[PDB]
Design a protein around this ligand. Structure first.
Ligand SMILES: [Zn+2]
Lengths: 52, 121, 38, 47, 74, 52, 134, 123
RNA sequence: GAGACCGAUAGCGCACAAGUAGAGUGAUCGAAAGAUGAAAAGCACUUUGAAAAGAGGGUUAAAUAGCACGUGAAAUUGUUGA
RNA sequence: UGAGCCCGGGUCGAACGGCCUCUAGUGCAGAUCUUGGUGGUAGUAGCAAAUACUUCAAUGAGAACUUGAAGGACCGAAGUG
RNA sequence: AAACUUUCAACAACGGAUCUCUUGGUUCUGGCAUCGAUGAAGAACGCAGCGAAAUGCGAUAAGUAAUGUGAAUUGCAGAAUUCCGUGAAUCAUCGAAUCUUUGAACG
């Protein structure tokens, strides 16, 4: 979680309130990063993540 | 989006590091925007991964060349820069030690060596 | 059971991946004798 | 003591002990019937 | 069960009471090998796996285990 | 090869069974289980007078 | 007759080599002959085929048909020549596979590498011709 | 390919089915029952067989078949109702009738010239 | 590099994703399984059918070669005729 | 005489034969032979106990064992939870 | 008379024998001598745009560097190559590198 937070802050300029991680059955990790109220998840996803 | 080995060889350390950082940032951006509409962007990402490998290889080779120049005239060298050969080949006697001969044998060969001769028919 | 290890979980994942079927483009590849997963 | 089982029906072509729960068993067939006749003829010839 | 996974050979042949692999003998440094089972010897003999380095040795011998780079290389 | 046909573990089932008195392969989970072996008259077995 | 011990007269090994050769050996195998005018122009008999060559199919169902080589398909030892095609059931057009030993090169794709190849072949041929003549 | 090669294909309509999950014996008996008839009469008879109104005689494969009065239509006492075999024969007959309509023949004057049931690889 | 060898029940267990699939708690045991066609040119379009498929039509020298594919015996079975 | 040899018709596609010697893993009805395949028995024996299912409607090419409603039964907190 | 049982023939089934073929085996012969703490043999997990296995490779991951050849790969998709060029390739050679977890296995 510390590395995930540091990477999100350093690269994509995302501030996160918290991070919850699990390991999927296939072997990959899934991370739910809950962001600060100041930023908007929809705006960040549309701009930096390219997700509609 | 392909880098050239000759250009990387010509460039020095700082430019190689800057190029590697640029390639890695581009790789992250293209992956995030590739997860949707992975296409010719997949092609670009494949070429960019190969480029990152090329830059890393060039940096490592230049650093090893500098280290070899540093250890050119030193008695001990790192195992990485030491020759590999095989275990038995590394444990064999050196050429000088294997060709070393006793002084009495050296005198005998100096004064009574194998002579050239022919015998008629 | 519910209590396991990440390594055994990864082995289970590899078990499913091996128990994935065959691709049709593999079938259509030239010189191919593969028909079904054995 | 020993139970004799014919190698027929469910007992034909079995690797080992049949379903008959017994301490000691012996399987029989016509081939060993002829074996036994030859052995008995040799015994009579000896006597 | 009396047999779980051995780390050295990957089979379910590790006794849990004796703590010894029935196939390779994990605790012992040597790999279990007997000459009355040529089938087992050829099942786990060299060449049945990947040969990461022993495969690269012969080409180096052919070239003479030479070190360096070709003249004029960039 | 001198090992042609000798590379199996077979034993005769016995005399009391209504089957041919031929060495048969042990096992139980494949076609080769229970099949004849070590015979010049048997499939995947030896041949009479192996050539030397 | 074979003399040197390096050479093999074995059908099995010959066919293994032919059918498992890599791409470069496949190119050398798929070399094709030159036209007559090109022969008296270059003193070269044959040359590996490539994509820029114009050839004339002289054997097969297509008797004497010319065209520009569109694709050389080294995996199945065939080349694709322009317009020597057949329609599938659907009407979609697919090229026919014609062998380089069956095509004859009419106009050659000139570049530095192939000029060097032709120069080397000519040098060898003229040296041996001079040696045989005198 | 078809066994009966002496019939011209421009005047006849043919249907075929391979690897059908039905009983070979029952299918043979019912095909022999419907052999040589008009298409409409065969269809009506097969639907009656499904509805348990008429039954096919058990002639060759007739092990321990109970008797029924309908058997007197065939001069036999042992008759049976192979519903699934009847259904598949109806399917093939409708396919053949569609083929005859496509070729333009008169469907009212068609007879079943050839019928054959062979064994398929066993499952 | 070769052979008066064997030629898919033969020859190594293995001509093939074979020490594989599978069996045994385990030491271990351990198979079966090659071939369309010169070239996929692996049947467009129409019709019946829920579909699988079928019938026209078409490719090819050949579909009496349709990916249950070279040739295709006997056992056994169906139809036809005597 | 015979083991056998030869020709015709159909199928099929790529190699094969006669003669004199040489050579051998060379000739089959059996071996409760080996492997593979196929029969009669035979559409035969047989497809258990847990009391028990019924009506309408919907889906569907096709409905006893797909679903919704209603009726009749059951596990009976030491359960068919 | 039909049906049924049996016989003969043609076609069609079942089945995979015979003939043909062989990137396989088997035997003989010839040149050579080369595993490993600089971490071997073996096991494990990952790596392709689309891959399950075989194969290759190791987070530089069906691969990088260098040399050579000289214009491909291919099942599809997308890119190439200006071709009068340090340069395509599931290419060859191969002297530099990368080389995850165990395994003699070593906090
Ligand atoms: Zn072990």
């Amino acid at each position: 979680k510390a590395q995930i937070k540091q990477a999100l802050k350093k690269l994509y300029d995302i501030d996160t309130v918290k991070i919850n991680t699990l390991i999927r059955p296939d072997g990959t990790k899934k991370a739910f990063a809950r962001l600060t109220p100041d930023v908007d998840a929809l705006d960040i996803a549309a701009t930096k993540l390219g997700l509609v | 989006g392909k880098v050239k080995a000759g250009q990387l060889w010509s460039k020095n350390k700082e430019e190689l590091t800057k190029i590697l950082g640029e390639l890695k940032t581009e790789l992250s951006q293209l992956r995030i925007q590739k997860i949707s509409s992975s296409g010719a962007k997949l092609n670009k990402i494949h070429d960019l991964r190969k480029s990152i490998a090329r830059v890393l290889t060039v940096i490592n080779a230049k650093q090893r060349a500098q280290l070899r120049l540093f250890y050119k005239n030193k008695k001990y060298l790192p195992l990485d820069l030491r020759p590999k050969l095989t275990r038995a080949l590394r444990r064999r006697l050196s050429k000088e030690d294997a060709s070393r001969v006793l002084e009495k044998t050296k005198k005998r060969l100096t004064h009574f060596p194998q002579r050239k001769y022919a015998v008629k028919a | 059971p519910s209590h396991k290890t990440f390594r055994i979980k990864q082995k289970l994942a590899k078990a499913q991946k091996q128990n994935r079927p065959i691709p049709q483009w593999i079938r259509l590849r030239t010189g191919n004798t593969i028909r079904y997963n054995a | 003591q020993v139970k004799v089982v014919k190698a027929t029906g469910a007992n034909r072509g079995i690797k080992g002990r049949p379903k008959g729960v017994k301490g000691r068993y012996k399987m029989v067939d016509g081939r060993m019937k002829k074996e036994m006749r030859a052995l008995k003829r040799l015994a009579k010839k000896k006597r | 069960k009396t047999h779980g996974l051995c780390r050295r050979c990957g089979r379910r042949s590790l006794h849990n009471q004796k703590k010894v692999c029935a196939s390779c003998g994990y605790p012992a440094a040597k790999t279990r090998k007997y000459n009355w089972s040529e089938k087992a010897k050829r099942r786990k003999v060299t060449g049945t796996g990947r040969m990461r380095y022993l495969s690269t040795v012969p080409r180096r011998f052919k070239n003479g285990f030479r070190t360096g780079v070709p003249k004029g290389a960039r | 090869s001198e090992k042609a046909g000798h590379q199996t573990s077979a034993e005769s089932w016995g005399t009391g069974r209504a089957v041919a008195r031929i060495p048969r392969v042990s096992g139980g989970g494949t076609h080769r289980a229970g099949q004849g072996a070590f015979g010049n008259m048997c499939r995947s077995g030896r041949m009479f007078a192996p050539t030397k | 007759m074979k003399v040197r011990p390096t050479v093999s007269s074995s059908r099995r090994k010959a066919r293994k080599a032919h059918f498992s050769a890599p791409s470069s050996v496949r190119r050398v195998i798929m070399s094709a002959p030159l036209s007559k005018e090109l022969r008296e122009k270059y003193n070269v008999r044959s040359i590996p085929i490539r994509k820029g060559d114009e050839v004339q199919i002289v054997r097969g169902a297509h008797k004497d048909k010319e065209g520009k080589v569109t694709s050389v398909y080294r995996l199945k030892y065939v080349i694709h020549v322009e317009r020597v095609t057949r329609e599938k059931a659907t009407g979609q057009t697919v090229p026919i596979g014609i062998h380089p030993s069956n095509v004859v090169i009419t106009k050659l794709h000139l570049d530095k590498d192939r000029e060097n190849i032709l120069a080397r072949i000519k040098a060898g041929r003229e040296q041996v011709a001079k040696a045989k003549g005198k | 390919r078809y066994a009966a090669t002496e019939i011209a294909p421009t005047k006849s309509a043919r249907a075929r089915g391979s690897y059908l999950r039905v009983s070979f014996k029952n299918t043979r008996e019912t095909a022999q029952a419907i052999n040589g008839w008009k298409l409409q009469r065969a269809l009506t008879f097969l639907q009656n067989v499904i509805d348990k109104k008429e039954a096919v005689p058990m002639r060759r494969y007739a092990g321990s078949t109970g008797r029924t009065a309908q058997g007197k239509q065939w001069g036999v006492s042992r008759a049976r109702w192979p519903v699934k075999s009847a259904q598949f024969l109806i399917g093939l007959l409708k396919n053949a009738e569609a083929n005859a309509d496509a070729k333009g023949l008169d469907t009212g004057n068609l007879i079943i010239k050839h019928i054959q049931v062979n064994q398929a690889p066993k499952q």
